């Protein structure tokens, strides 16, 4: 219920990096992404959906990268 | 070219080419509004969403940039882009894609699962540029009618062609797939439902 952390991590990274490879957005967000406790590559992936979602993210058109939105 | 103008004033209702002008249209040209053909000529025309008049300039305008004068003229012209949807996997996919707008409800943002299988159904079939084992496609419909999702997103949308395109069988999908991939949840859901 509480993956909320984890859409406030990738959109801090996300927004001073401006553009990642799935992959490392998707390590690099669980690098400084525990730390409040461990988390499957399952949960970080759904955040992606929920910012894709919202209007925070958009899917390069390779479709394996992600580019932050205004 | 007043042939054009004429056809144009055919088919119009109080004054405007309307949805219901467009599918007396189509049906005379021999084809159905729910036809892979009308999202070519939808397409062709500029729609932006179906159910939008079309301007009397933009009939006039492309019809004549192709070189169409008559309605077997015309006729002539979709079924060479029906054909180039069956032929060309670049326009397949162009296509496809703008599909989703087309179908989609300016007053939301998903379109709801019932409608996106209606045009699976014709995308996937085993004829297109897209080959697959007709019984992968039943899966995924079974697994969305099963686990209750009611709509779908523009992003799953233009994410499962490219996912049918690397998987035509759910064999080599058991065999490969990676979880760990930009594929979006709701592929993994349905990966993990495979057995």
Same mark, same amino acid.
């Given at each position: 219920?509480? !993956? ?14 401006? #553009? ?6 998707? #390590? ?6 525990? !730390?409040?406790? #461990?988390? @499957? ?12 979602? @919202? %209007?925070?993210?958009?899917? %390069?058109?390779? %479709? ?7 | 070219?007043? &042939? ?29 509004? &729910?036809? =892979?053909?009308? *999202? ?19 009939? =006039? +305008?492309?019809?004549?940039? $192709? ?7 015309? $006729? ?10 069956? &032929? ?13 707008? =087309? ?18 159904? =014709? ?23 099963? &686990?209750? /999702?009611?709509?779908? +997103? ?17 064999? /080599? ?20 439902? *495979?057995?």
């Amino acid at each position: 219920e509480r !993956q909320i952390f984890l859409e406030a991590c990738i959109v801090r990274i996300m927004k001073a990096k401006r #553009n990642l490879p799935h992959t490392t957005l998707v #390590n690099e967000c669980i690098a400084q992404s525990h !730390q409040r406790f #461990n988390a @499957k590559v399952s949960m970080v992936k759904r955040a992606i959906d929920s910012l894709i979602q @919202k %209007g925070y993210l958009q899917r %390069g058109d390779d %479709g394996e990268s992600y580019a932050y939105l205004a | 070219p007043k &042939e054009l103008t004429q056809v144009f004033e055919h088919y119009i209702n109080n004054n405007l080419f309307d949805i219901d002008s467009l599918v007396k249209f189509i049906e005379e040209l021999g084809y159905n509004l &729910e036809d =892979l053909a009308t *999202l070519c000529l939808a397409h062709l025309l500029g729609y932006k969403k179906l159910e939008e008049p079309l301007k009397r300039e933009d009939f =006039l +305008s492309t019809w004549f940039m $192709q070189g169409c004068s008559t309605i077997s003229d015309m $006729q002539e012209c979709i079924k060479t882009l029906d054909v180039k949807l069956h &032929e060309d996997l670049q326009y397949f996919t162009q296509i496809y894609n703008y599909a989703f707008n =087309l179908i989609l409800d300016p007053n939301r943002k998903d379109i709801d699962t019932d409608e996106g299988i209606q045009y699976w159904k =014709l995308f996937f079939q085993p004829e297109y540029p897209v080959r697959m084992e007709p019984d992968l496609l039943e899966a995924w419909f079974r697994f969305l009618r099963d &686990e209750g /999702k009611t709509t779908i +997103s523009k992003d799953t949308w233009r994410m499962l062609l490219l996912f049918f395109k690397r998987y035509p069988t759910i064999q /080599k999908i058991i065999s490969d797939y990676d979880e760990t991939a930009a594929w979006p949840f709701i592929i993994d859901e349905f990966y993990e439902c *495979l057995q």
